[PDB]
């Protein structure tokens, strides 16, 4: 399975990554094992869509984590995701963008 | 059918365009850049709204 | 200027029918227009990006009157999103481009 | 609005504010009268406890989603493909009803709307610059502490929000026996008034 994430920073890159060999140490996943994917955000939103769907797409996850940025609320952080994984039925995670529009 | 429909949408942004002329006698373009713009945010240059 | 997206997967009333006239009619004062139309297929996130922004490259003041015959409802979220980051007017007409 | 109500002297001696999480932070602190309740939330803006929290819940959903009728690959490339995985709802189906107690934040209960529930806050007041803590929420029950709000104006006793106005705008109608309408005087007052029996009679 391939539970690939979009994050932050790099730090939480490897957070993620640390936290997905813990989980593998409490359980297991026989189909092509539980490696995940990450990648950062972009100023362009029609990139990071873009990006997104040649990705995660083409890995053929299951899921997605979403995070807002240090940007301050630009208000399109997790959009282009929720959009691209809306034209299929592949659920997102929000980490934190507390907003009732969503 | 289809046909009367791309008509009417046609001949809706035409008589937009034309109302656009005859309240600012300029058009402006929105072939900026797609990938990798990162130029500004909109302007209220041709805000065809009303 | 103006633009017609088509491709017409169920009904194959497109092409040179619709490609001449448009907005030439007999309007008092008209303008220089074109009816410059494209053909697509089932649609796809990354196609419909690409197409887009290749029309919006070959446009200068451009609308839009893209349609579709999926059953998918994200087009029109989709398009709304194409529509956010271009300032260029679309009008949705039939098929998942009319799921309000 | 914070700088209008300064200036229309709406802060001082009751008025008690409320102020949500985006009132207190950044720029707002600077103009701010003393004595705002400004609700906050713990540990909503670290990441790693979330992150955990959310691995180890997609980790339970996926453990009891692989026992069901029949699993397809998803959709791949997104370039070739255009209808949706039969099996996608049923994962949101799963993933909803997920009460992960293996969890670092608390006990996660997803409601059906899509948000968080059971989200533990904190209640936060400034006084004089500075915040201070003064409650946690557990979930439809508020506890305070031992401290005393001071409220904004210094009033030690909580500020209560009854005064009536004690001034009534009444309104009437012109009627034959019930309540008359005469031309005033033109000197600009009413009087001259007898009863049969012999008495004034109350005018206004």
Redesign the interface.
């Known amino acids: 399975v391939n539970i690939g994430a979009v994050l932050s920073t790099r730090k939480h890159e490897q957070m993620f990554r640390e936290a997905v060999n813990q989980a593998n140490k409490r359980h297991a996943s026989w189909k092509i094992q539980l490696n995940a994917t990450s990648v950062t955000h972009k100023p362009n939103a029609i990139q990071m869509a873009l990006s997104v769907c040649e990705d995660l797409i083409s890995s053929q996850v299951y899921a997605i984590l979403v995070s807002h940025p240090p940007t301050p609320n630009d208000h399109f952080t997790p959009t282009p995701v929720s959009y691209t994984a809306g034209f299929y039925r592949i659920p997102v995670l929000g980490l934190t963008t507390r907003m009732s529009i969503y | 059918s289809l046909e009367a429909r791309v008509r009417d949408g046609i001949g809706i942004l035409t008589t937009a365009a034309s109302s656009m002329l005859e309240k600012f006698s300029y058009i402006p373009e929105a072939k900026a850049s797609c990938y990798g713009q990162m130029e500004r945010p909109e302007v209220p240059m041709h805000t065809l709204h009303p | 200027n103006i633009a017609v997206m088509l491709g017409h997967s169920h009904d194959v009333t497109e092409r040179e029918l619709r490609t001449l006239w448009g907005p030439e009619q007999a309007a008092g004062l008209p303008l220089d227009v074109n009816v410059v139309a494209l053909l697509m297929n089932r649609t796809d996130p990354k196609s419909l990006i690409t197409h887009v922004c290749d029309l919006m490259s070959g446009a200068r003041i451009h609308g839009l009157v893209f349609g579709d015959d999926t059953d998918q409802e994200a087009v029109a979220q989709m398009l709304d999103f194409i529509s956010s980051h271009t300032f260029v007017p679309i009008l949705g007409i039939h098929g998942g481009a009319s799921m309000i | 609005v914070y700088r209008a109500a300064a200036m229309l002297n709406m802060t001082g001696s009751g008025y008690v504010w409320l102020v949500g999480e985006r009132e207190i932070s950044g720029n707002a602190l600077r103009y701010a009268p003393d004595g705002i309740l400004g609700l906050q939330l713990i540990n909503?803006?670290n990441?790693?406890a979330?992150?955990?929290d959310?691995?180890?819940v997609?980790?339970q959903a996926?453990?009891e989603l692989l026992e069901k009728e029949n699993i397809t690959?998803?959709?791949?490339?997104?370039?070739?493909?255009?209808n949706?995985?039969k099996t996608?709802?049923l994962?949101?189906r799963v993933?909803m009803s997920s009460k992960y107690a293996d969890g670092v934040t608390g006990r996660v209960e997803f409601n059906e709307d899509?948000d968080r529930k059971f989200a533990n806050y904190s209640i936060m007041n400034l006084q004089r610059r500075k915040l201070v803590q003064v409650g946690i929420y557990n979930g439809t029950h508020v506890i305070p502490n031992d401290r005393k709000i001071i409220w904004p104006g210094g009033e030690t006793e909580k500020p209560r929000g009854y005064q009536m106005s004690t001034r009534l705008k009444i309104v009437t109608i012109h009627q034959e026996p019930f309540v008359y309408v005469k031309p005033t005087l033109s000197d600009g007052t009413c009087k001259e008034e007898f009863t049969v029996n012999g008495d004034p009679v109350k005018k206004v």
Do not use: M, Q, Y
């Open positions: 909503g803006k990441e790693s979330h992150i955990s959310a691995v180890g997609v980790a996926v453990h690959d998803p959709p791949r490339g997104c370039v070739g493909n255009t949706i995985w996608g709802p994962f949101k993933l899509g």
